Ligand binder design. Sequence first.
Ligand SMILES: CC1=C(C/C=C(\C)CCC[C@H](C)CCC[C@H](C)CCCC(C)C)C(=O)c2ccccc2C1=O
Ligand code: SF4
Lengths: 143, 33, 80, 163, 60, 741, 41, 122
Amino acid sequence: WKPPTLDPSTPSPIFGGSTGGLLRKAQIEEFYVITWDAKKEQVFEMPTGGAAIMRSGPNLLKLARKEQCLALLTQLRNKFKTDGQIYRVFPDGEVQYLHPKDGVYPEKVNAGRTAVGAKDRSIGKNTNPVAVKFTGKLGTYDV
Amino acid sequence: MAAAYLPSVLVPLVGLVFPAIAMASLFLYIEKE
Amino acid sequence: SHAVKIYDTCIGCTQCVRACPTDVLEMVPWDGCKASQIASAPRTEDCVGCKRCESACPTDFLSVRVYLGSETTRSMGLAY
Amino acid sequence: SGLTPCSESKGFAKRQKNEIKALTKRLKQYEEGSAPSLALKATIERTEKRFANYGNAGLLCGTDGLPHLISDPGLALRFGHAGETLIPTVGFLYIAGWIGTAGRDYLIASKGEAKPREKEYIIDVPLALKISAQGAGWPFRVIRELQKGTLLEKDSNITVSPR
Amino acid sequence: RLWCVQVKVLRPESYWFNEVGKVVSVDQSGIRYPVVVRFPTVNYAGVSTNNYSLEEVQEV
Amino acid sequence: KKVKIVVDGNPVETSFERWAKPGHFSRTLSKGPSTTTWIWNLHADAHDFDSHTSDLEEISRKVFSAHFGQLGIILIWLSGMYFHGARFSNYEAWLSDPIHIKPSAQVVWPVVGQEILNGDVGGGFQGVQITSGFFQLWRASGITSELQLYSTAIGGLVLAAAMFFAGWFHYHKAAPKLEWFQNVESMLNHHLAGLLGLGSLAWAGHQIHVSLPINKLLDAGVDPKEIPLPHEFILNRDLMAQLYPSFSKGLAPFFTINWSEYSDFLTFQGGLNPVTGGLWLSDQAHHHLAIAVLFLVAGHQYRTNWGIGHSIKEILEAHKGPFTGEGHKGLYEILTTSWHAQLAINLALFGSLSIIVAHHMYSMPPYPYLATDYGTQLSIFTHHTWIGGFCIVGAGAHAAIFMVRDYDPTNNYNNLLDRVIRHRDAIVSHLNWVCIFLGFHSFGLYIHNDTMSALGRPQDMFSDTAIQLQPVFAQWIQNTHLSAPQFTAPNALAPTSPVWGGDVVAVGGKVAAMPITLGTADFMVHHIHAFTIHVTVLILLKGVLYARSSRLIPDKANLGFRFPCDGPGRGGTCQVSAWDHVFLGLFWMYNSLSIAIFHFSWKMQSDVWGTVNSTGVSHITGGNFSQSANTINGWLRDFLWAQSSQVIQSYGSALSAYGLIFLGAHFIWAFSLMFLFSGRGYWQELIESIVWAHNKLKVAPSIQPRALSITQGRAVGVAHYLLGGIATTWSFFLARIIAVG
Amino acid sequence: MKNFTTYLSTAPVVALIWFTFTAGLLIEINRFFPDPLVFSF
Amino acid sequence: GMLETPVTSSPLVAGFLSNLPAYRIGVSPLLRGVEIGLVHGFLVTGPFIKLGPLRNIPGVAERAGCLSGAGLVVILAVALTIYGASAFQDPLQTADGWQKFSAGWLVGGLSGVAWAWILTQT
Ligand SMILES: CC1=C(C/C=C(\C)CCC[C@H](C)CCC[C@H](C)CCCC(C)C)C(=O)c2ccccc2C1=O
Ligand code: SF4
C-alpha cells in the first residue's frame, strides 16, 4: 500500500455556498481536504451547515478543520457506505495525507503499527507529583 | 491646602496620561514576538 | 498539545478509537490482553481534548487517559 | 437569666390585651350569630386559653413579654422547665430512632431478596407495616447490636478512595 | 481463581475496592489481567465487570 | 385523496400491568434502576413520545389522548373555580355592591392560627381575596345566583369526565390512523369554521339573549334577585323588547337584510360603559357575530372532498422567488410529519397571543367593574404576560428539537430552511450587533442619568425637563387613534380605548381608564424592552440555527438535542446543546418580562390608577414615573423600596401570606444558585463520603445514590430560579395592589 | 387487582398515603389541642 | 464555497468600495490616512460640540468640542501607531506603510478638527 496523492482537479459537490466555510486560517495557517468516490448522485449534509449534492464519481471538499472532515467521513461511512481520504494542505502547497494513515481504518488492528503513549502499568501505579518536582516533566504520567 | 494646583495636574496624569502609556507599552510588550 | 496515554489494563475493545473525532487513536498488535490488540495515540497533536475516548472506555479505572496540556490552534478546535 | 414568669409579666398581659382588643375591633363589624362573628369569637377564646395555658405552664418571659425556653437540662430540672426542651428531646429522639431503625430493618430485609433494588421503589407494604410496628422496641435491639458488634460494618468491607 | 468464587478486590483505584465480586472466568493464555469479576453494583460508567490480575483479587 | 374516518379497533389493552412497571415505555428504563438517576430519567422521558418509538402513528395517538387528558384536567380546574364561587364565596353580596366589596372565593380552615387569612373582604364574608377576575366574568355572563354557578360546576365535571373518557377511548378502543391525523386541510377547515366560527356565533347568541338584558338591568340599578332569569328573556319576547325594541320585529330584519333595525343591541359605540367601566356588551355581541361570520368564511378555504378549495402544498410550492431558491417547497412535508415543528409554530403564536391579550385586556377592559379592581387588572396582565413568555421559550425549544431530530437534508435542498441554515453566521452576527447596540443605547442612557444625577447635574440628564427623548411616533399613533371617530371610522362613536386621549372614565370614584401619555421615561423603557426581547431572540435563534453543527462541534446533531457538553477540550464546550440555549433563554425571558411587568405596575400606579375627587385625579404614587423612572436609582427607590412596604408590613393581617411567600420565594431563588453555580463532581464526591457513613451502619441503599446529571442540575437551577423570582414579584404585586387598591 | 395494588405500592403513592396520614395526624392534633408550645398539661 | 450576495458581489458595491481611500488603486498610504483623518476628524467634533458638558455656553461650546475632537484624534493616532508596531513585525499592510498611514491620520484629523472649528466660527 502507498499513500494516495491529492488531485486538485477533482470536482466539488454541488453547493450554493454558505457562511460556514473557510476563513483566513485556510490561506495563512492550514486547511483540510476530504476526497471520496460516490456511487451515485445524492444529497448529503455539510458539516458546516446545509445540504449539498455529491456528484457521481470522485468528489473534493475543502474544510477548515480535521474534525469537520472526519465528521463528514463518519457520515459517508455510516449513511452512504463510502470510504474517503483526508489530506492536510499547507499555504506553501505541501499536502500531508492524514486518514486512513496506513490505508486501514484505525479501529481495525493492522500490522506494522507501533504503540505510542503506552504505559506498562495500571493507572493507579503512577507516582506522586512531589516526585517530579523540578524535573521539567509534564506530570506523573510523563515518567 | 498647600500647592492646591497639584491635584489638577497629578489627577489627569495618574488617571489619563499614565494609564494610556501603561496600556500602550504593555500591549506592545504582550504582542512582541 | 494534550497528552494521551494508554495503560496496560486495555482490553482492546476499540471503542476509544471509534469515539475519537479527530483520529488520534488506533489499535496496534499486542499480547497483554485476550483481544491481542492495544490502543495507541500516535497523533496527539490533533487531540482536541474532548475525552470521548475516556467516556467510551469500559475498564475500571480508565485505560486511556487524556491530560490537557498546552493549547494550540488544533487543540482549541479553531476554524479561524 | 433575669427573666420573670409569664403569669406575672406585664408585657405578657399587655400582649394578651392587645390581641384580644384587635380581634374585638374586627368583631364589631359583623352581626351576632353570623359565621364571621362565630369564627372571631372562637379565635378570641383560643387566644385567651393559649395565654392562660402559657401562664400556667411556668414559662419565663423576657422584657418583650414573650416566653423564653430553657434548654440546659440542669436549669430545666431544678426550676420546672423540663417540658420545654428536655422532654421534647426525649420524645423526638425516640421517634427518630424508631424511623431510622424501621428504615434500616427494611433495607436489611430487602438486601436478602433476589431483586434488592425492586423493594426500594415498589414498597413491600405488608413487610413495611410489620417492620414499622416493630420499631417501638428499637433501643433494646439497637443497643444489643452495638454490644454484639453487628451494628457496624467492618472497615475492610467498605470501599474507600485512594489516599 | 476458581469459577463463581467470591473474591475481594485489592486494586485501590477500582470502584469496587474492598468489595466482593463473583469470578466469571480466568484466562489461561498469560494475559496481564486474566480474572474476570462480575459485581452486583455498577460503577460510575454503568459497568458491572472488570478484569483483575492474580494479586489484585483475594478469595473470600 | 379522500378525507375519511379511519381508526384501529382495540389497539391497546386497558390493564394495570404497566402501571406496576415504571419505565415500561422506554427500552432503556424498563429494566429497572441501578442508580438514582433512573428515578429522574423516568419522569424526564415520560412525555417524550418520539423517544419511546419511531412510529409516527403511535406518537400521534399518544398526543391525541394526552390532549384529551389535558382538556379534562382544565375542565376539572374550571369546574372547581365555578364551585368555589358557588359555595365558598361572597359573589351575591358582591353583585349587590361591586364597588365596596372585595371578591373572595377561598376560605381557609381554622387550624394552627391560619384563620387570620380569612380577611374582612366585605359582604358579611371572610376569606382570601381573589384576583383572577371570575366575579366580573360571571357578572358579564349574566350569572346572578350561586345555583347557576353550581350548574356550571356540575356540567363542567360531566364534560371533564367525557374528556377523560375520550382520551381512553381514542387510545385503547378506537385509535385513529396516521392518515387521519395528516388531514391538515380538513383540520383547518373544521377548526376555523366549526371551532372558532361556531364558538363565536354561539357566544354572540349567549351575549345577545342573556348577557345584554341582565347587565342592562344591573346597570339600571335593579336588584339582582328582582332581575328575571335568562330563560324568561328567551321565552317572553315582550320582556326582551322592553329593553331592546328591535326584538319586537323578530328575525324578520335579519332575513330581509334590514340589519340596521338591530342597531339598539348590535352597536359600534366603542369606548367604555360609564356605569361599569367595561366595554359595551352590545359592542361585544356585534364583535362576536362579525368574528363568527369571518371565521365561517375562513373555514371554507381548503380542499377536502368536493373539488373546490386550496391545496396547502400547492400554495407553499407556488410561493418562491429569485432571492429564496426553492422557496416554501418541502414545508408541507415537514409540518405534516413533525409534531415538534407544529408545536414550535403554535407555541410561538399562542404565547404572542397571550401577551397581546394582556395588553388589550388592560387597555379596553371587557368586564364590568374589572378596571377599578386594580388587583385583578395587575394580576391578569402579569399572568398572561408570563404565560406568553414561557410559551415563546418553548417555541424555541421545540424548533431546536425539530432541527436535531426531524430535520432531513435530503428533503430540504435549497429551500428556505436550507438557505437560512446556510447563512446562520450572518444572522447571528447581525443580531449580536443589534443586541449590543440596543444594550448600549438603552441601558447606558440609564447609567448616564444615574451618573448625572449623582454628580449634581440634572440638566445633563435624559429627561422631560432636560435633554428630551420624546417618543414621537407613538405620540402620533395615539393622536391618530384619538381622532379616528372623526374621519377614518365615522360610524364609531368613541375611540377604542381611553388610553389614546380624551376624558377620564371613573367608576365609584376610582379611575377605570384614562389617557396614558408617553415621555422620555416611556421611550427609555420601550427601548429596554426592545433590547431584552432581541437578546432572548438571539439566544433562542442561535440555539435553533446551531443545533446540528457549528465550527466548534461539527457533529452536534449526533450528540442529540439535550446533552451537557462535549468535554473540556476545544477550550471547553460546556452548554453547546440547543437545550442549554433554551436554558439561558429562560433567564433572559424572565429578565425581559420582569421589566415589562414592572413598567406596567409603576406606570399604571403613577399615571392611570387613582381616586377621582372633585378637584381632579390623585394617583396611587402621584405621578412619580415621569420624574424618576429615568434612573436605576429611581426604580430601586421609588418602585422597589417604596412599593414593597405593603408586603413587608403585611404580618398580622390577611395579607401576611404574601409576606411569607415573599420571604420563601427569595429563599427559593437563592436556593437555585447552588445548582447553577456548582457542578456535579463535587456533589458526587460528597455523596461518596455520605455513602461511606451509610455503609458503616449498614444503611446503604441498593439503588445507588448519584448526584444529579449536569443537565438536571441546570434544569433544577433554572426552575427554582424562575419559581423564586416570579413568586417574589407575585407576592410583592398582590400585597401592594390589594392593600393600596 | 394484583397489578393495581402493586401500583399503589410504588414509592410516590406510598409517600402520598404516608404523608397524608402524617400531615392529617399533625393537623388533627393541633386542632384538638390548639397552640402546643410546651409539654405541660 | 463562500456565499456571495448582491451586498457582497454587486458591481455598484465594488465600485463604491474601490473609490474609498482605503481601497483606491494607486494612493500612498500617507495620503489615504490624510483623507480618512480629514473625514473622521471633521465628523467627531459634532457630537462633542452639540452634546458636551459646555454645550449651553456660547463660544466655549465649539472650542471645547473641537478640543475634545482633537484629543480623540490624538488618542486614535496613538492607537494606530501601536497597532502597526504589533501587527507588522499591499504597501498599507506593512510596518512603514502603517507608520505613514498613522502620520497621515494624525495630520488629517487635526486638519479636519481645525476645519470644523473654522466652519462653526463662520
Ligand atoms: C445540591 C446539588 C446537588 C445535590 C442534590 C441532589 C443529589 C438531589 C437530592 C434530592 C432529594 C432530596 C434526594 C432524595 C430523594 C428521595 C426520593 C426522597 C426520599 C425522602 C423521603 C422523606 C420522601 C447535585 O447533585 C448537583 C448536580 C449538578 C449541579 C448542581 C448540583 C447541586 O447543586
Ligand atoms: S465542566 Fe462539566 S459541562 Fe463543562 S466541559 Fe467539563 S464536564 Fe462538560
